[model samples]
Target: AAVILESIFLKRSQQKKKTSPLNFKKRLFLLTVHKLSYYEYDFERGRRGSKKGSIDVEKITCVETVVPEKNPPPERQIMEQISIIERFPYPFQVVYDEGPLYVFSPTEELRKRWIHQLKNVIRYNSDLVQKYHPCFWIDGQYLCCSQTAKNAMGCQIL
Candidate 1:
């Protein structure tokens, strides 16, 4: 697929739909027609670093922002590292399959831009949802609704 768009974004795997610790990686995300993949961004080359992993575009249930975590999970005794919540606060989630990917943006303008373009690309996905959790799904439940299922119906309508 030809490149539709690309950007540098912080990506965190929220796999299994259980709240995970802050392990965000800086990557050059390449968005395409049928898949969305990412690669490590080389500082010298100023582009991707040939990493691998992607999502099937049609598997996306939605693309939207979530309420920011108050603090990063306590794996590292971060006195200030967790301030990313306040620093790069424009975070969004890409809900794919029953799993999700968390991405933080540099600014709200770009955040909205990404969301708009993403929604545009997936408009005809057919399985797209109009409801979302708005907040993080933690442990075995969603913070916004306490819904136990990882792929449970959302608490808020998008």
Candidate 2:
């Protein structure tokens, strides 16, 4: 994936001079490059398997989803996400973490609740987790001090 992405990015850069754009259009191309870098890094190297990795971007395929706000019911949203996980255990699975990230479609509330549930689960195993090794997310799109050792690219996607 890294090689493929790099080739694509190089092609894009070469095209930039040939293809003209509006005053603000250049950033769009740059941002797409940034976004792909994240996936490329995850595919090539890996992350720390830490909770610090924040979830971003949710892609929707040809599937149905139910989102909630104000906590409609205990079983509704909860069951929906559970079924999603059952159907695709690796959907939420990050390149760095064993557990999957819960996804809520059509609404932001569902995403928030999913994060909440993840925190609770982590808290439940807090003691044991603490004793074990600690990992952290790359965080942001660009490489920072925390990620310097990894020799990663910047937030190409944004």
Candidate 3:
């Protein structure tokens, strides 16, 4: 079963683009046990639109916070980013890969919460993985095992 951990509003933007007023738009952000999803909005019509995109927990490789500093004070904004492990010609090429989802929270606390929840999902939360590890059910009886410490293929059935 999956649980909804957080649902918040964030401004979604893509770096591989020309400057436009609508580049950064509001998105309905949702974080679940296994996936992160976002919905777009038709700002002109003042109505919610279709799904923008999503990233699965299994695909997330790294998560971090970025703060950009220009030649002025007040800075740009604080962003929490989740990026997938993929190869590209340049570091900035990631923007075109539909990855490293960027988001901005209304406050620092909420931002931290978002990153925490994302990390838990990426790490598989231990408890969630243990409940279904290397086990097969036969006729309602469950069987599991682990290989001997030294032997790569040796197993002790449990």
* lDDT tens per residue, model 1, 7-88: 7777666554336564667677888878888887787875568875788889998999888877754421124434433345
Model 2 lDDT tens row, 49-129? 222223222221111111222332322242654353222211121111222122222234433443344343333332222
Best lDDT goes to which candidate? 1
Regions of candidate 1 where Cα sits further than 4 Å from its true position: 16-22, 72-87
Q: What lDDT, from 0 to 1, does candidate 2 have?
A: 0.23
Give the TM-score comparing model 1 with the true structure, all chains together: 0.80
Give the alpha carbon lDDT tens digit for every residue of 1-158 in model 3.
46555444544354324453323444666777777777775657965579877767666554444332122122123223321111111111001123344455555556667767776766763222211212221122223343222112212221
Tell me which residue pairs clash in candidate 3.
none
Task: Determine which window of 10 residues in candidate 3 has minimal summed lDDT.
Answer: 85-94
Per-candidate TM-score against the hidden true structure: 0.80, 0.22, 0.50
Ranking by lDDT: 1, 3, 2
Predicted model with the maximum TM-score: 1
Error of 1 at 48 (Å): 0.8
Clashing pairs in 2: 34-156, 34-157, 35-156, 35-157, 92-101, 141-155, 142-155
